[PDB]
């Protein structure tokens, strides 16, 4: 429950992190205009990606590990090959098919890339063609975050709707309609069962759902919790819910009872991103303080 | 602890050296925010200065400038306005002769955008600079269509004094910031001279904010 190592090593306004598939590497995205692949154990960066557009708000590391996607409000999505023969990081193809801002891009697969953008829709993109195989539409507001299933077949997104909508990636169909949010969904995470998920937002409550139930299971609300939630993540075994807040500190709730299990009060600045390793070994916190620190 | 570890240390230090050099190179550039509405004179300001957002870069004397034209975002402003928190100045452009056009006059709704952007908590202390447009035809036409409560003459000088003051009087919590109103003739030679003096007035305050004395 205490900090084992601290990485830091950036300049300004770290927005997002995504854990690598090795459970050791992580990618750090910042508004500076530089993308960094970190390593947790040796605390030394392994790659630096310059950015044509400095404005980035999301990042993606492929579960293969071969590719890294970064986008922005430019409406242009960039996927970089880390392991080029030349050794430099080069953008595979520009991806400009949206009319808003690319709020979140993730990696369903190497060829099939899911991007949630601020054109009130999400679209499945191929690097080979640069065109939308399936486009997911039905959100009133602008989508900001999405959470893929471990199967990477049924995923959900949240917009300025006070609602979340599942999607089916093959036929481009909305699968479920989740409503029950009071405010705008800042971040959403998926339960690695593939059967449930929980979400938090600015309304200072984290809410537990199940995809097949389409019903709120229980709500995580506290009186001292007036600040909003901007990051949620789980444990590999449940019994836990990592959640960063607008109180400049993360917090931990039980997935079943949500007591004051873990108090995470490290960062001075607003915790922008929070992720759990794919084996669940560590907790990673990121913030605009140019700091990266990981606890255990 | 071998050749692999030593070489990894050298690459992880070389990356940080190049990173530090690039950061020091980037820190000199002045960041400017343009919030030009429809018919604000984006073409006029980009000419007089000479799918996503356009980033123009221009050099005046010994100081560079990077203005980020956020245009046609068509999105909720709050989700991305905090991205420009470190931007030194906010440029506003308003047309004056379109007070006979109701789509709820455009002047009144443009004030609300200024009212919202002034009272935001993110921009506690950011200098606000507003420029004007189409003032000549406003003289040619003019009162009752937009601001009948003025209840005075249709003289352009007093009417411009009324509009610019009440646009500046909308400030309620910007007492840290300074509204730098400039009456853009839309044909004046260098209205970046207003910007350069205003941005150096920020910079003089910026140093005096860091010297301790203010």
């Amino acid at each position: 429950m205490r900090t084992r190592r601290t990485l830091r090593g950036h300049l300004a306004k770290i927005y997002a992190m995504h854990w690598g598939t090795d459970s050791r590497l992580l990618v750090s995205a910042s508004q500076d205009g530089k993308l960094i692949i970190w390593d947790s154990y040796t605390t030394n960066k392994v790659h630096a990606i310059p950015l044509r557009s400095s404005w980035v708000m999301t990042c993606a590391y492929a579960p293969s590990g071969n590719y890294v996607a970064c986008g922005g409000l430019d409406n242009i999505c960039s996927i970089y090959n880390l392991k080029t023969r030349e050794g430099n990081v080069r953008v595979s193809r520009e991806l400009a098919g949206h009319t808003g801002y690319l709020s979140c891009c993730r990696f369903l697969d190497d060829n099939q890339i899911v991007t949630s953008s601020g054109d009130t829709t999400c679209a499945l993109w191929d690097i080979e063609t640069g065109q939308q195989t399936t486009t997911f539409t039905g959100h009133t507001g602008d989508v900001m975050s999405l959470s893929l299933a471990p199967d990477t077949r049924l995923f959900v997104s949240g917009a300025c709707d006070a609602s979340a909508k599942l999607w089916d990636v093959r036929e481009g169909m909305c699968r479920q309609t989740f409503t029950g949010h009071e405010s705008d969904i800042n971040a959403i995470c998926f339960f690695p069962n593939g059967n449930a998920f929980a979400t938090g937002s600015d309304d200072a409550t984290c809410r537990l759902f199940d995809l097949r139930a389409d019903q709120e299971l229980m709500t995580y609300s506290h009186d001292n919790i007036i600040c909003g939630i901007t990051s949620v993540s789980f444990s590999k075994s449940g019994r836990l819910l990592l959640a960063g807040y607008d109180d400049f500190n993360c917090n931990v709730w039980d997935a079943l009872k949500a007591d004051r299990a873990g108090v995470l009060a490290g960062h001075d600045n607003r915790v922008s991103c929070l992720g759990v390793t794919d084996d669940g070994m560590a907790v990673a916190t990121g913030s605009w303080d140019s700091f990266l620190k990981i606890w255990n | 602890l071998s050749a692999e570890d030593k070489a990894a240390v050298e690459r992880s230090k070389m990356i940080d050296r190049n990173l530090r050099e690039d950061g020091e190179k980037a820190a000199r550039e002045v960041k400017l925010l343009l919030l030009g509405a429809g018919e604000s004179g984006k073409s006029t300001i980009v000419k007089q200065m000479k799918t996503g957002i356009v980033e123009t870069h221009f050099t005046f004397k010994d100081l560079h400038f990077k203005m980020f034209d956020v245009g046609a975002q068509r999105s909720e402003r709050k989700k991305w306005i905090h991205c420009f928190e470190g931007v030194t100045a906010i440029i506003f452009c308003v047309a004056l002769s379109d007070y006979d056009l109701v789509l709820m006059n455009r002047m009144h709704e443009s004030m609300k955008l200024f009212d919202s952007i002034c009272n935001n908590k993110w921009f506690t202390d950011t200098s606000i600079i507003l420029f004007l447009n189409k003032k000549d035809l406003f003289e040619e036409k003019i009162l009752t269509i937009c601001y009948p409560e003025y209840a005075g003459s249709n003289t352009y000088e007093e009417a411009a004094a009324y509009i610019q003051c009440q646009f500046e009087d909308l400030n309620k919590r910007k007492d840290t910031k300074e509204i730098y109103t400039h009456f853009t003739c839309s044909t004046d030679t260098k209205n970046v001279q207003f910007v350069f003096d205003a941005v150096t007035d920020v910079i003089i305050k910026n140093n005096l904010k860091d010297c301790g004395l203010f």
Epitope: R24, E86 | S2, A3, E4, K6, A7, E10, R11
Partner: single-chain antibody, 232 residues
Framework: DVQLVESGGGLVQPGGSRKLSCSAS????????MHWVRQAPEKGLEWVAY????????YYADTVKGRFTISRDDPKNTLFLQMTSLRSEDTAMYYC??????????????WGQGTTLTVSSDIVMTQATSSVPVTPGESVSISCRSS???????????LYWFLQRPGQSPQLLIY???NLASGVPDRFSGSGSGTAFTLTISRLEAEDVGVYYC?????????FGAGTKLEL
């Protein structure tokens, strides 16, 4: 993709000096680590020198200290190495090497053509037999036998294995005991314990011929096996 061409590998007076350099293009040599590897004209690869990407760490071998020097050039994007006091042992077919270093990187992946230079403790690794007659389609095994264990305290060994084709530029087959290199068929696979190591060649055919090598990275001394011919 990448280009490594050595410049002027020729005759040297005994004990003299001569500038040798591998001209380079098409890769981030600024961010890349470089090596030079010698080949005696009959038998034996071993490491010579290493220059870092940031030119901060310089390491030489036992007969490379002082009398050999190294240097680089980033805008022209090439590498130099100056050799003085050249004798019969100093004569070798030196190979210009690039080698990127991080987690999962594949160092010693590409080579040049060579420097044809003719005039006029240490960890010990040896491959078990240097000549094995084979048949194109039956599985064989070859073992590089070290002297001390290769397993680091962090639990992951560092040990790289190589294939030299008959008279041309070599390749890397498997790096750090578990990871196959790009452009290499899966039929080649290394194995062994933390101290003993052996190759599992499966269903070989008529391009695997040539000398085979080990190399480690737990200690800076390499001194790997002198080679193993795999003759038809």
């Amino acid at each position: 993709d990448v280009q490594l061409v050595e410049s002027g590998g020729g005759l040297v007076q005994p004990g003299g000096s001569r500038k040798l350099s591998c001209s380079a293009s098409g890769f981030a040599f600024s961010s890349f680590g470089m090596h030079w590897v010698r080949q005696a004209p009959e038998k034996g690869l071993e490491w010579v020198a290493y220059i870092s990407s940031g030119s901060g760490t310089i390491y030489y071998a036992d007969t490379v200290k002082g009398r050999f020097t190294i240097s680089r050039d980033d805008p022209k994007n090439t590498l130099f190495l100056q050799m003085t006091s050249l004798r019969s042992e100093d004569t070798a077919m030196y190979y210009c090497v690039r080698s990127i270093y991080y987690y999962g990187s594949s160092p010693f992946d590409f080579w040049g053509q060579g420097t044809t230079l003719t005039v006029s403790s240490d960890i010990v690794m040896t491959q078990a037999t240097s000549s094995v007659p084979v048949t194109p389609g039956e599985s064989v095994s070859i073992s590089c036998r070290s002297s001390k264990s290769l397993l680091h305290s962090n639990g992951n060994t560092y040990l790289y294995w190589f294939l030299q084709r008959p008279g041309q530029s070599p390749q890397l087959l498997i790096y750090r005991m578990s990871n196959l290199a790009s452009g290499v068929p899966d039929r080649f696979s290394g194995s062994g314990s933390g101290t003993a190591f052996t190759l599992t060649i499966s269903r070989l055919e008529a391009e695997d011929v040539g000398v085979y090598y080990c190399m480690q990275h737990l200690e800076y001394p390499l001194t790997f096996g002198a080679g193993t011919k795999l003759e038809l």
